[PDB]
Design an enzyme around this catalytic site. Structure first.
Site, PDB file in Angstrom:
ATOM      1  N   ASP A  16     -53.979  28.782  43.441  1.00 21.48           N
ATOM      2  CA  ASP A  16     -52.997  28.989  44.497  1.00 21.48           C
ATOM      3  C   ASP A  16     -51.787  29.780  44.019  1.00 21.48           C
ATOM      4  O   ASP A  16     -51.081  30.368  44.846  1.00 21.48           O
ATOM      5  CB  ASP A  16     -52.546  27.643  45.067  1.00 21.48           C
ATOM      6  CG  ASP A  16     -52.072  27.747  46.503  1.00 21.48           C
ATOM      7  OD1 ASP A  16     -52.212  28.835  47.099  1.00 21.48           O
ATOM      8  OD2 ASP A  16     -51.560  26.740  47.036  1.00 21.48           O
ATOM      9  N   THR A  32     -48.014  34.188  45.654  1.00 28.94           N
ATOM     10  CA  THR A  32     -48.151  35.184  44.599  1.00 28.94           C
ATOM     11  C   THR A  32     -47.810  36.593  45.058  1.00 28.94           C
ATOM     12  O   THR A  32     -47.347  37.402  44.245  1.00 28.94           O
ATOM     13  CB  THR A  32     -49.580  35.172  44.042  1.00 28.94           C
ATOM     14  OG1 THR A  32     -50.058  33.823  43.976  1.00 28.94           O
ATOM     15  CG2 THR A  32     -49.615  35.781  42.648  1.00 28.94           C
ATOM     16  N   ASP A  50     -53.572  24.334  52.927  1.00 25.66           N
ATOM     17  CA  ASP A  50     -53.103  25.694  53.172  1.00 25.66           C
ATOM     18  C   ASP A  50     -53.549  26.192  54.541  1.00 25.66           C
ATOM     19  O   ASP A  50     -52.774  26.836  55.259  1.00 25.66           O
ATOM     20  CB  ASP A  50     -53.603  26.629  52.070  1.00 25.66           C
ATOM     21  CG  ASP A  50     -52.803  26.499  50.789  1.00 25.66           C
ATOM     22  OD1 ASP A  50     -51.646  26.034  50.853  1.00 25.66           O
ATOM     23  OD2 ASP A  50     -53.332  26.863  49.717  1.00 25.66           O
TER      24      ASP A  50
END
Ligand SMILES: Nc1ncnc2c1ncn2[C@@H]1O[C@H](COP(=O)(O)OP(=O)(O)O)[C@@H](O)[C@H]1O
Ligand SMILES: Nc1ncnc2c1ncn2[C@@H]1O[C@H](COP(=O)(O)OP(=O)(O)O)[C@@H](O)[C@H]1O
Ligand SMILES: Nc1ncnc2c1ncn2[C@@H]1O[C@H](COP(=O)(O)OP(=O)(O)O)[C@@H](O)[C@H]1O
Ligand SMILES: [Mg+2]
Ligand SMILES: [Mg+2]
Ligand SMILES: [Mg+2]
Ligand SMILES: [Mg+2]
Lengths: 532, 523, 60, 520, 39
Positions: free
Chosen positions: A54, A88, A391
């Site tokens: 993740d 990210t 998520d």
């Protein structure tokens, strides 16, 4: 001269060190960005495998002694806490912006002008995102949510089997629907019990319409299947009576100690009889339960669960309509119990899931709950599936909260880079280079996607830049800005039709966080490290 | 020193995948030694100081300390497979090792792992569909069929010479474990079939007692030892005068107050004893201690008392007799008195008293007694009995049968090969590669039997090409092609499905790792 | 500024930087007190006063 | 089990190894980044013995750095090659290579084939060489003073960013007269460089003969005249002292008669040799072997000068200046084997005794007397003199110079940018990056004095696009001007050599894929 | 992960300085020498 008792740098050395640290942090998690990326592994000293990708968890479980690394880690943590998706990409964009600003700083340019140009470019990009919005109610709704869930779960371990998990997530979101104060509908998350148990494959993990408790029954003599039971939530331990510290017992007559010892249990017996006087079958106690209460519940024919969590009890009381009573007192001086505050359920059967049992609660009559029992290989796959489901739920909630979908695949970044490049010609000052660097910094997402896909990067970038340049001019062909990009063939597909579906608030927040991180770091030109 | 991290070692690329594949192949080659009836036993030495001599696939893997994450994942999936169905712990590991070994041929041909995982999932779906289509039903009312199934399932362990009685023992245990309470819930827990291990005697003296076997003795020799039809009752509270947690003090100023308190204590004890002996019991079983006055009262009333028992033992006694544990002696009632007994004899098994509750009306909990030599033989017999009981429970839960040995694997391989001709693209080579990877079990069986695979493999491949030739296996004893319908070897479908699912999940999880980070000290 | 316990602080005011520098010379240990007194009295210009004092001491 | 390679072998991949190599090569450029333009400075390197090494040239800095990186050694090799070839632009090639590496770093990290990059580098280098040879602008027939003026201008341009920049107009004529009187093969070993402690920069003189330091004398050195009008130099090579004949000899005398006969015959042979040397009409005797005290006392009684322990290089320089020959035996001392000069004195310069042999019309060598500091200043002066001599030699051997500054680089960048608009595909980006990397010379030239490099570069690009061919930068005017009219000329072969060396270094660095290291 | 690469020999023992501080130190040393050789 200058006794500081430590270490210090100069001016460009600290900037180069920060740029190198940011580049290393970006390259650490640069192989798990696109949907074709693989997962990583984190092992500690005692031997604990942690398979995840993740980004936020990897940055949290990294322990780096660098200021820029800690700043990026806390930024990713804030992004994951406020949204949950895109942890990210924001860090990669911030690192690319820092690398682009380092070249401008090295070219004898003041950082204030670069910061102003970056802020202007970010404001122009934010103002330009609203031009490419799609109404969620104008489409189909269910299909759009399914596509968004499949896109959010495309870079996880359940990317192939996304036809059932997306539908299960949509059903759970539709079931867990809370209304505000007669205004806008709310979609609260982190309320569905996501259980992890090893067993068969992941395709057998169905949706449990109701609640699921992670506790077993008290006594073995209690039944495990009660039809149309009464849920009685309690917030006090069911033990014997015990005096306080300031109330002592001074026995002065031998004809009263036995009476006191008998009343010490008779009080609890009368309390249990008054509790079960309304005809209750399911009693949940967050504290401890003595053997006498267990025997009484067995003789009366009712279930009793001890050591229950507070959040689980609150969710059960909210779903069944019951009320958590911390005491038996009322508006007078007599401990009574009414029958109007009893949660009515249906079938409470205890099922064994691989050498362990757990009590499940079906639907009631007040509201509708949702429970997911994920099944997989061991614990790492179960944790990965739980993270992917969380998520996906967060993405679905963010999509349903703001009816605004935006296509993905790298077309939005190219469109923003083209718009900022075309707008930089209207300034005429020193901010044009800053705007051009801000536009070129957004092109790192398609490059990373092409690198992870092991395809032609420069060719695809040139094709995207040639296709997006024709969408700005010629108003007769304004539908060329929704082509997207494919990683399985290497050619622009439909994308906006049903392929990629992502919200815009997440991208706006990521861009704002990247801009703030690039601003708060470029204003550094000296470091003073003291000795412990 | 100015570095980012400390003592951190990061390694990425094809080296991690190569090391994982090598570790999986080593684990598969180590675990392949115990397979088929012609296999041999091993011996492990635990750090405690004991001796672990068994042949199960999970008992040997759990006593091996490793350091590679792939080996840890293999141990974890093996333990989950052993805790799920109970049987089939080595076949899943061998299949996972073979699938990970045949996957390295495509990783070196610039092939993306996503297509490999997609092909693996598509092959798993087709295998599940084929296994569900070739499912053969079976009746649960036939005892001979169940006995033959149990014998064919336990023909690999060391009970190949005593399965004539172990099969009936497991059948009786399964029949006595199944209990239906309230509603439409039929649970089959294994916490009520206590297995006792007593060293000594012959292996033929083992049987199934209609009750339990508590290793205790009477509190006084004056009590009875042989009762015909006793009334066994249960207790929970202690039979002695205890203190109080309410902080009480008895301030006395006279002289006879001590004598009054000492007399009131005995009066309360006698009242509690009279409340116990209310419906005229016979055998009192409590979990705490019993004072001397209560023992004397029970001896005067001709009542037997047993102290220091366990909760599981008390639950088993209540399930066998048919009563319930009562905490307060004043609420004994009548239905709480157990009258399901028929024999209460206390014998001595090697200078040790033992309680025997035999001959019951309708018992729902039995205790299997095992008599062997040392402790390793008893542990092996207990493990074999537990595996047989788990297999019988899995068969009763799903009345499905599939031909074992190597006929089902060859049938699935042929069905996948006959269907792979319609596919096209890059999803055809991995499909045909994993279609032939299921032959690792019959090849290993032939290698362990007569060690002549280069002929038997092609003989079985050329035989399954015909129409009605899907139940042809390989005999592990001799080494010839025989029919599975006349041999009597059968296996359940749920175990094979769980094995296939676990192997596919492990292959998918291991085919998506290309980075190793170690040196963060967790916190 | 990075302290010994590991706290990274980023500030632009001269008084905070001088306080976090932790000097050892009395000529430098008086300037931090001067900046603190200037920030207590007025609040702004904590860096201009130090520059003026340094320029005067250099011209002396 | 048994390992494959030796335990302790470091390995690497491809992309990370290339990234690390680029990051390591980017640090070497920062060491020779300040020493470039006229406003630049120098560095100071300290070895492990405690000796300071002050040198503005990048070659000495790279040699005294002692780099152990396998990828950083490519810059030292090309620097040494450039110093041995022409000896001029030693840091420009390194800067160009670093700029090319920094430009191709994103193209490499994106995912491009190294062969295409190597082919693009080769094509760009060939195009730049062809363009430079086309716009070389050479002459065929010039005047006699025009060549001297061009040599002086080239010397002043080469000695602009050196330590003797304040006296560049004084050493130009000196190096011109030194190179012009170097026969035809241009013998660099014939030029003597002497360093005497004391004096300033204006006290440096250039003699038209030979000069060397006074060797070790004896007791009869202050009894002979140290000044002659028209003497005769006789370069010999035999020892003039009382010693034995051969080391492998043995005399077996009988009585005292033959003993005294041999004792007298030794001195008789010595006197006969001393007379044969004196009968040649010489006045100055120079030999490599040390001269004894007997010959020194014999030569002082006849008013003759003598000096022994003469080095080989000094003797060869004196022979080439006068016109004699090395005579081993003294039995053939004629008139054609003796030197001739116009004056010979011996003054005290800096507390040291030195000899002068000026006044030779047939001389083909000279001797430089460099004064100034003590050690580092004299070394820097000698390095600058050698660089100027090499520049003048190259200008004589090639007679092709172009305009200096950043005009040639700007023209090459403009030509490469105009040529990139013809070939499509991925070849356009590489040529564009190569053209953009060529503009690092004017930026670094303008950034050394604290000027706005961006505005100057934009003005230069506009002037090159609107035309306006030899437009460079200016330091004193703080703007741009024509470098062709400012007497700023540099050899054109130096730029070609630097470009070829940079291209070769870039190709060798890009070709590196896996680096294998072995212990010890 | 930015692994440090070895460039100069024995880099963990030598020290490199910029330029302004070196010039200031040289000026201070020259002033001290002139003050010592002044009486
Ligand atoms: N199915 C898909 N098709 C095309 N692009 C995708 C797909 N799934 C993800 N992406 C791209 O991958 C990028 C990263 O997505 P995601 O993994 O959700 O965020 P993060 O990498 O931060 O976890 C997005 O910018 C998106 O454009
Ligand atoms: N007598 C037999 N005849 C045919 N096949 C057998 C026989 N015994 C064992 N097998 C086969 O060998 C395989 C391995 O069984 P076993 O070693 O007992 O347990 P595991 O499946 O855990 O390895 C089984 O799948 C079974 O089909
Ligand atoms: N007087 C001058 N006018 C214009 N440019 C000059 C002048 N002197 C030097 N330069 C430029 O400075 C650069 C550096 O030259 P120099 O220091 O002599 O050797 P290197 O190139 O090895 O540093 C040359 O490329 C030259 O173009
Ligand atoms: Mg995501
Ligand atoms: Mg078995
Ligand atoms: Mg202020
Ligand atoms: Mg030069």
């Amino acid at each position: 001269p200058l006794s500081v008792f430590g270490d210090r740098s100069t001016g460009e050395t600290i900037r180069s060190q920060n740029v190198m640290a940011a580049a290393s942090i970006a390259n650490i998690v640069k192989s798990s960005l696109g949907p074709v990326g693989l997962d990583k592994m984190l092992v500690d000293d005692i031997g604990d495998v942690t398979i995840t990708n993740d980004g936020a968890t990897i940055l949290k479980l990294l322990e780096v002694e660098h200021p820029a690394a800690k700043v990026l880690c806390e930024l990713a943590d804030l992004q994951d806490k406020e949204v949950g998706d895109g942890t990210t990409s924001v860090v990669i964009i911030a690192a690319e912006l820092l690398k682009n600003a380092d070249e401008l700083v090295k070219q004898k340019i003041h950082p204030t002008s670069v910061i102003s140009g970056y802020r202007l470019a970010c404001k122009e990009a934010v103002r330009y995102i609203n031009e490419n919005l799609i109404v969620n109610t104008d489409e189909l709704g269910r299909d759009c949510l399914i596509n968004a869930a499949k896109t959010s779960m495309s870079s996880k371990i359940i990317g192939i089997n996304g036809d059932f998990f997306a539908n299960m997530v949509v059903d759970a979101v539709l079931a867990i629907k809370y209304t505000d104060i007669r205004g806008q509908p709310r979609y609260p998350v982190n309320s569905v019990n996501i259980l992890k148990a090893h067993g068969r494959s992941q395709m057998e993990s169905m949706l449990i319409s109701g609640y699921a408790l992670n506790c077993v029954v008290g006594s073995q003599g209690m039944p495990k299947r009660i039809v149309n039971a009464k849920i009685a939530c309690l917030d006090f331990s069911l033990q014997k009576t015990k005096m306080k510290l300031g109330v002592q017992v001074v026995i002065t007559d031998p004809e009263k100690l036995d009476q006191i010892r008998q009343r010490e249990s008779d009080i609890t017996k009368e309390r249990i009889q008054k509790i079960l006087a309304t005809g209750a079958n399911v009693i949940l106690t967050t504290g401890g339960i003595d053997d006498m209460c267990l025997k009484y519940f067995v003789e009366a024919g009712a279930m009793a669960v001890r050591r229950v969590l507070k959040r689980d009890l609150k969710r059960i009381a909210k779903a069944s309509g019951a009320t958590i009573l911390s005491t038996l007192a009322n508006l007078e001086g007599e401990e009574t119990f009414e029958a109007a505050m009893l949660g009515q359920a249906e079938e409470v059967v205890q099922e064994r899931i691989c050498d362990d049992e757990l009590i499940l609660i079906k639907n009631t009559k007040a509201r509708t709950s949702a429970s997911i029992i994920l099944r997989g290989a061991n614990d790492f796959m179960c944790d990965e599936m739980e993270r992917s489901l969380h998520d996906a739920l967060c993405v679905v909630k963010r999509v349903l909260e703001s009816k605004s979908v935006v296509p993905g695949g790298g077309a939005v970044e190219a469109a923003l880079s083209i718009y900022l490049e075309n707008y930089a010609t209207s300034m005429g000052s020193r901010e044009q280079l800053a705007i051009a660097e801000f536009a070129r910094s957004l092109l790192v997402i398609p490059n990373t996607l092409a690198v992870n896909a092991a395809q032609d990067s420069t060719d695809l970038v040139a094709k995207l830049r040639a296709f997006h340049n024709e969408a700005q001019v010629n108003p007769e062909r304004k539908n060329l800005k929704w082509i997207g990009l494919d990683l399985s063939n290497g050619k622009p597909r439909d994308n906006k039709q049903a392929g990629v579906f992502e919200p815009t608030i997440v991208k706006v927040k990521s861009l704002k966080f990247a801009t703030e991180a690039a601003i708060t770091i470029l204003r550094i030109d000296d470091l003073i490290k003291l000795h412990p | 020193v100015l570095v980012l991290s400390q003592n951190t070692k990061r390694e990425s690329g094809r080296k991690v995948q190569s090391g994982n594949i090598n570790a999986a192949k080593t684990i598969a080659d180590i675990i392949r030694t115990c397979l088929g009836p012609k296999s041999m036993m091993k011996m492990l030495l635990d750090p405690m100081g004991g001796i672990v001599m068994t042949n199960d696939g999970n008992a040997i893997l759990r006593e091996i300390q490793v350091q590679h994450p792939a080996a840890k994942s293999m141990i974890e999936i093996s333990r989950t497979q052993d805790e799920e169905v109970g049987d089939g712990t080595t076949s899943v590991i061998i299949l996972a090792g073979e699938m990970l070994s045949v996957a390295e041929h495509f990783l070196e041909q610039q092939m993306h792992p996503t297509v490999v995982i997609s092909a693996y999932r598509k092959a798993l779906d087709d295998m599940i569909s084929t296994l569900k289509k070739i499912s053969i039903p079976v009746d649960i009312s036939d005892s001979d069929m169940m006995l033959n199934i149990i014998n064919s399932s336990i023909t690999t362990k060391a009970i190949s010479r005593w399965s004539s009685l172990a099969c009936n023992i497991a059948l009786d245990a399964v029949k006595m474990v199944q209990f239906e309470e309230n509603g439409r819930k039929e649970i089959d827990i294994k916490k009520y079939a206590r297995v006792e291990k007593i060293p000594g005697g012959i292996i033929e003296d083992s049987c199934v007692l209609r009750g339990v076997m508590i290793n205790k003795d009477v509190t006084h020799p004056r009590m009875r030892r042989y009762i015909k039809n006793p009334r066994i009752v249960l207790l929970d509270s202690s039979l002695e005068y205890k203190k109080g947690e309410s902080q009480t003090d008895i301030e006395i100023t006279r002289e006879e107050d001590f004598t009054r308190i000492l007399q009131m204590e005995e009066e309360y004890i006698q009242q509690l004893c009279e409340d116990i002996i209310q419906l005229k019991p016979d055998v009192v079983i409590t979990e705490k201690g019993i004072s001397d006055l209560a023992q004397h009262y029970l001896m005067r009333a001709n009542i037997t008392a047993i102290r220091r028992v366990r909760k599981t033992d008390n639950n088993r006694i209540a399930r066998a007799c048919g009563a319930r544990i009562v905490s307060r002696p004043e609420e004994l009632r009548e239905d709480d008195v157990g009258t399901g007994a028929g024999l209460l004899e206390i014998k001595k098994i090697g200078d040790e008293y033992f309680t025997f509750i035999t001959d019951c009306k309708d018992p729902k909990a039995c205790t299997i007694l095992l008599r062997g030599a040392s402790k390793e033989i008893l542990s092996e017999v207990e493990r074999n009995l537990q595996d047989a009981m788990q297999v019988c429970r899995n068969v009763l839960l799903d009345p499905q049968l599939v031909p074992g040995g190597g006929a089902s694997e060859m049938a699935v391989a042929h069905a996948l090969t006959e269907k792979s001709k319609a596919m096209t693209g890059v999803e055809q080579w991995p499909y045909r590669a994993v279609a032939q990877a299921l032959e690792v079990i019959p090849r290993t069986l032939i290698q362990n039997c007569g060690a002549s695979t280069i002929r038997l493999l092609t003989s079985l491949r050329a035989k399954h090409t015909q129409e009605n030739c899907e139940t042809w296996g390989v005999n592990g004893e001799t080494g010839t092609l025989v029919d599975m319908k006349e041999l009597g070897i059968w296996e359940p479908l749920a175990v094979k499905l769980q094995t296939y699912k676990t192997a596919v999940e492990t292959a998918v999880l291991l085919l998506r790792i290309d980075d190793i980070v170690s040196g963060h000290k967790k916190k | 500024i990075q302290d010994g316990k590991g706290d990274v602080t980023i500030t632009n005011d001269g008084a905070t930087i001088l306080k976090q520098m932790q000097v050892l010379h009395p000529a430098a240990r008086m300037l931090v007190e001067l900046s603190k007194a200037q920030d207590i009295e007025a609040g702004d210009g904590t860096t201009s006063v130090v520059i003026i004092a340094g320029s005067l001491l250099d011209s002396c | 089990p048994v390992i494959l390679l030796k335990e302790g072998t470091d390995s690497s991949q491809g992309i990370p190894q290339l990234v690390s190599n680029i990051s390591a090569c980017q640090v070497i450029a920062e060491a020779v980044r300040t020493t470039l333009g006229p406003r630049g400075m120098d560095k100071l390197i300290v070895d492990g013995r405690g000796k300071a090494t002050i040198s503005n040239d990048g070659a000495t800095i790279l040699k005294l750095l002692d780099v152990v990186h396998p990828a950083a050694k490519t810059l030292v090799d090309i620097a040494k090659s450039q110093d041995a070839e022409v000896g001029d632009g030693t840091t420009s090639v390194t800067l160009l290579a670093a700029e090319f590496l920094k430009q191709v770093k994103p193209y490499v990290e994106e995912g491009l084939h190294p062969q295409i990059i190597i082919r693009a580098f080769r094509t760009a280098t060939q195009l730049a060489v062809n363009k430079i040879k086309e716009i070389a602008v050479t002459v065929k027939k010039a005047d006699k003073v025009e060549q001297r003026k061009l040599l002086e201008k080239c010397a002043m341009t080469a000695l602009s960013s050196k330590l003797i920049s304040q006296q560049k107009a004084f050493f130009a004529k000196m190096v011109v007269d030194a190179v012009m009187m170097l026969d035809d093969l241009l013998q660099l070993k014939m030029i003597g460089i002497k360093k005497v402690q004391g004096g300033a920069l204006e006290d440096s003189q250039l003699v038209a003969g030979v000069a060397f330091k006074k060797t070790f004398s004896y007791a009869g050195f202050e009894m002979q005249p140290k000044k002659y009008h028209n003497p005769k130099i006789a370069l010999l090579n035999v020892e003039l002292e009382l010693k034995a004949e051969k080391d492998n000899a043995e005399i077996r005398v009988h009585t005292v008669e033959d003993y005294q006969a041999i004792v007298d015959a030794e001195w008789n042979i010595l006197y006969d040799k001393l007379e044969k040397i004196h009968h040649s009409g010489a006045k100055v005797v120079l030999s490599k072997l040390p001269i004894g005290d007997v010959a020194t006392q014999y030569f002082a009684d006849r008013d003759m000068f003598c000096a022994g322990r003469v080095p080989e290089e000094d003797l060869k320089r004196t022979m080439m200046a006068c016109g004699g020959s090395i005579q081993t035996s003294v039995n053939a001392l004629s008139a054609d084997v003796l030197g001739r000069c116009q004056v010979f004195e011996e003054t005290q310069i800096g507390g040291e005794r030195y000899n002068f042999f000026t006044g030779c019309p047939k001389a083909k060598t000279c001797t430089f007397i460099l004064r100034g500091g003590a050690e580092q200043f004299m070394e820097e002066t000698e390095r600058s003199l050698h660089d100027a001599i090499m520049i003048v030699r190259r200008a004589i051997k090639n007679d092709s110079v172009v305009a200096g500054g950043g005009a040639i680089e700007m023209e090459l960048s403009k030509y490469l940018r105009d040529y990139s608009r013809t070939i499509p595909g991925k070849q356009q980006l590489l040529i564009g990056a190569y053209a953009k990397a060529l503009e690092i010379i004017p930026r670094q030239l303008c950034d050394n004095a604290g000027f706005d490099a961006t505005n100057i570069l934009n003005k230069l690009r506009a002037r090159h696009a609107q035309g306006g061919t030899w437009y460079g930068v200016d330091i004193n005017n703080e703007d741009i001007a024509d470098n062709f009219e400012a007497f700023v000329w540099e050899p054109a072969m130096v730029r070609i050599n630097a470009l070829t060396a940079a291209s070769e270094a870039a190709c060798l660095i890009v070709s590196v894929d896996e680096t294998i290291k072995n212990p010890r | 992960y930015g692994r440090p690469f070895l460039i100069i020999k024995d880099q963990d023992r030598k020290s490199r300085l910029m330029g302004l501080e070196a010039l200031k130190s040289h000026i201070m040393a020259a002033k001290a020498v002139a003050n010592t050789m002044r009486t």
